[PDB]
UniProtKB/TrEMBL annotation, chain A:
Belongs to the picornaviruses polyprotein family. Interacts with capsid protein VP1 and capsid protein VP3 in the mature capsid. Capsid protein VP1: Interacts with capsid protein VP0, and capsid protein VP3 to form heterotrimeric protomers. Five protomers subsequently associate to form pentamers which serve as building blocks for the capsid. Interacts with capsid protein VP2, capsid protein VP3 and capsid protein VP4 following cleavage of capsid protein VP0. The chain holds residues 500 to 550 of 2190 of the full protein. It comes from enterovirus D94. Capsid protein VP1: Forms an icosahedral capsid of pseudo T=3 symmetry with capsid proteins VP2 and VP3. The capsid is 300 Angstroms in diameter, composed of 60 copies of each capsid protein and enclosing the viral positive strand RNA genome. Capsid protein VP1 mainly forms the vertices of the capsid. Capsid protein VP1 interacts with host cell receptor to provide virion attachment to target host cells. This attachment induces virion internalization. Tyrosine kinases are probably involved in the entry process. After binding to its receptor, the capsid undergoes conformational changes. Capsid protein VP4: Lies on the inner surface of the capsid shell. After binding to the host receptor, the capsid undergoes conformational changes. Capsid protein VP4 is released, Capsid protein VP1 N-terminus is externalized, and together, they shape a pore in the host membrane through which the viral genome is translocated into the host cell cytoplasm. It is found in: Host cytoplasmic vesicle membrane; Host nucleus; Virion. This is Genome polyprotein. Transmembrane segments: none annotated.
Length: 51, 102
């Protein structure tokens, strides 16, 4: 079985501590999105495993 | 045991082109399967037979397009009623796709 090797990582570390006022909530959240540029390409169309 | 000699007259070099040297349709595989493995499966390669393998190994990198011809023959067993005109399906599975198991 052959699988393509890792192509890198995107990592986040917490430089400081989160500072909030007394009235604000003590917990926050972060959401992320992904996309591709105009230089992306694909080849050899196949059958998707997702049934 | 006879030492015969003949005068040879030749001209032209298009015969020894690599396109002509390697552009000969040769047998690459030959397998027989019964009515009920139950089907034919084979990964395409050149090294199956020694002659073609040696022909190809004279070069390090070769890039070519492959033309495949399938010649099926059917032989019956044991009363006789004729050779059936069975339909055959031949499917090419690329390297990134699963292959059938039955």
């Amino acid at each position: 079985k052959s699988i393509n090797a890792n192509v890198g990582y995107v990592t986040c570390f917490m430089q400081t501590n989160l500072i909030v006022p007394k009235e604000a909530a003590t917990s926050t959240y972060i959401i992320g999105f992904a996309a591709a540029k105009n230089d992306f390409s694909l080849r050899l169309m196949r059958d998707s495993p997702d049934i | 045991a006879i030492q015969t000699r003949a005068v040879i007259n030749q001209h032209g070099t298009s015969e020894t082109l690599v396109e002509n040297f390697l552009g000969r349709a040769a047998l690459v595989m030959m397998k027989d399967f019964e009515y009920k493995q139950n089907f034919f499966k084979w990964t395409i390669n050149t090294r199956s037979y020694v002659q073609l393998r040696r022909k190809f190994e004279l070069f390090t990198y070769i890039r070519f397009d492959s033309e495949i011809t399938i010649v099926p023959t059917i032989r019956l067993y044991t009363s006789y009623s004729g050779l059936p005109n069975l339909t055959l399906q031949a499917m090419f599975v690329p390297v990134g796709a699963p292959t059938p198991k039955s």
